[PDB]
């Protein structure tokens, strides 16, 4: 696949970024600092597996192996850590910029070619499977080296060199009272409005993002058989996985090192250490308990080899949609072991969509596991406005209950109500209709777990408030309806019966 990712961030040392046209507004230096801390913590929450670095230039001091002047690296390409967050945090604020100007140089001339060279060098200094390129920059000046046209020439030459070596750059607008005026030196050396302002994609960086976004990984490599010998390469995925809190990392009291776990069984009467062979599975049914060993217990659990065998075809309407047992799975055709299976997949999906019939198929996920009966639900490929898929093509995996899985229900009868009341809450729902969207409902409880986690990690002054969305805005609905609720209470309920006991 695509392995680790690298994101590199560049900010010039000059007094322009320490100053603003309006002192109420942030300095470019300070807003860049707070934005980079925000994206660092967002990445730590989201996809901490990748690699990040911090480097500065234009200072009165330099830190790099190449010893290019005023070129000062701060954090090399590493997975982000809380120490990095705090050591970039103290430099925020007015006092932060003051102490930065004190202990760190600020404001000098340099070359873009040399900073490009050293950043490419430190990118090369990583021995990990690289996935993508992201070398951010932050400047309010579009012509930093137009004084020497040779410097511009070598800068665009080195930009061509990076784009030849599979490196990709990106530019961030910074506020300019005279307008940043892109295309003066860019859109040709890099890969619209003059942008007096700066917010072009920083607003997407400032918003808090909390997820895990598991990368592209096959759930299981599976081989499908129709009757006895039709071999098909199929790949199973899931569009949804239950998100859980990360496991606690058990560790020592004082030193807080992670203590290893030792588990053992020993005799009581003898007192000596037991052995794994002596362990026997035991259950007590009736008077005579049952003596057993584990290996034959999973052998009894072992029924059939993994595979999907077609058990027939049933129209999609015959199944009752309320029958679910698990988050639905999704299969995709494969051509790894079997060649031409995708042609079969296309033909069968076309024919089944024409005939709107499900495909019942016995399911065996893993060896020595009980088999199961699943029906194949076809799914089309739906594009968005920009022709980007929103509904993936392929087949959904629905799970049908057994006889025992259907819990018995207490007897319930059919009771009718006046159609006047029916129209009444038809009006009620029409008052409060909206459209569901899947990208607006998170688990704020996990969000608060994380919130407390960075609050303790970075010693944040307050436990960050979880912006819950599960609570209804009851006042709004009550305002919208008002005198209709008591109308329902009089229409249906007797005017002496409280809903409580």
């Amino acid at each position: 696949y695509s392995g680790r990712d690298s994101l590199i961030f560049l900010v010039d040392a000059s007094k322009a970024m320490f100053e603003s046209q309006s002192e109420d507004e942030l300095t470019p230096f300070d807003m860049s600092i707070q934005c980079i801390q925000s994206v660092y913590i967002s990445k730590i929450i989201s996809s901490d597996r990748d690699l990040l670095a911090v480097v500065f230039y234009g200072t009165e001091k330099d830190k790099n192996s190449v010893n290019f002047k005023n070129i000062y690296v701060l954090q090399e390409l590493d997975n982000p850590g809380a120490k990095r967050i705090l050591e970039l945090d103290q430099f925020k604020g007015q006092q932060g910029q003051k102490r930065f100007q004190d202990m760190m140089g600020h404001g000098s001339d340099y070359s873009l070619s040399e900073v490009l060279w050293v950043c490419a060098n430190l990118f090369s200094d990583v021995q990990f499977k690289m996935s993508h390129k992201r070398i951010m920059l932050f400047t309010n000046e579009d012509n930093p080296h137009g004084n020497d046209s040779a410097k511009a020439s070598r800068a665009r030459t080195k930009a061509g060199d990076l784009r030849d070596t599979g490196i990709f750059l990106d530019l961030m607008h910074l506020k300019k009272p005279g307008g940043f005026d892109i295309s003066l030196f860019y859109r040709d050396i890099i890969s619209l409005r003059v942008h007096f302002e700066e917010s072009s994609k920083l607003e997407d960086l400032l918003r808090k993002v909390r997820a895990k976004e598991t990368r592209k990984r096959a759930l299981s490599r599976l081989k499908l058989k129709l009757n006895k010998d039709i071999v098909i390469s199929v790949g199973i995925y899931n569009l949804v996985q239950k998100a859980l809190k990360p496991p606690p990392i058990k560790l020592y009291r004082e030193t807080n090192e992670p203590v290893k776990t030792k588990t053992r069984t020993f005799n009581t009467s003898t007192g000596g250490l037991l052995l794994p062979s002596d362990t026997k599975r035991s259950q007590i049914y009736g008077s005579r308990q049952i003596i057993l060993e584990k290996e034959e217990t999973e052998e009894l659990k072992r029924f059939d080899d993994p595979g999907l065998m077609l058990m027939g075809f049933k129209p999609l309407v015959l199944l009752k949609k309320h029958h679910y047992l698990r988050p639905s799975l999704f299969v995709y055709p494969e051509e790894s072991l079997v060649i031409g299976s995708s042609t079969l997949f296309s033909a069968l999906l076309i024919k089944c969509l024409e005939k709107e019939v499900a495909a019942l198929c016995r399911y065996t996920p893993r060896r020595n596991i009980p088999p199961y009966f699943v029906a194949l639900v076809p799914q089309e490929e739906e594009l968005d406005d920009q022709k980007i898929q929103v509904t993936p093509p392929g087949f959904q995996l629905v799970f049908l209950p057994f006889a025992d899985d259907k819990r018995k229900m207490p007897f319930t009868e059919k009771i009718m109500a006046t159609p006047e009341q029916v129209g009444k809450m038809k009006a009620i729902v029409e008052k409060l209709r909206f459209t569901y969207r899947s990208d607006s409902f998170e688990n704020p409880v996990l969000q608060q777990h994380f919130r407390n986690l960075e609050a303790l990690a970075l010693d944040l002054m307050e436990p960050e408030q979880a912006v819950d969305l599960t609570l209804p805005k009851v006042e709004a609905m009550n305002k919208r309806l008002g005198s209709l609720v008591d109308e329902f209470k009089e229409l249906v309920y007797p005017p002496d019966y409280n809903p409580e006991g």
Partner: peptide, 23 residues
Amino acid sequence: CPGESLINPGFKSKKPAGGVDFD
């Protein structure tokens, strides 16, 4: 690329959770 996570290559951009907007 527009419509993709600028913070995450190979992933789409996600709009912040909004909740509800009744009609």
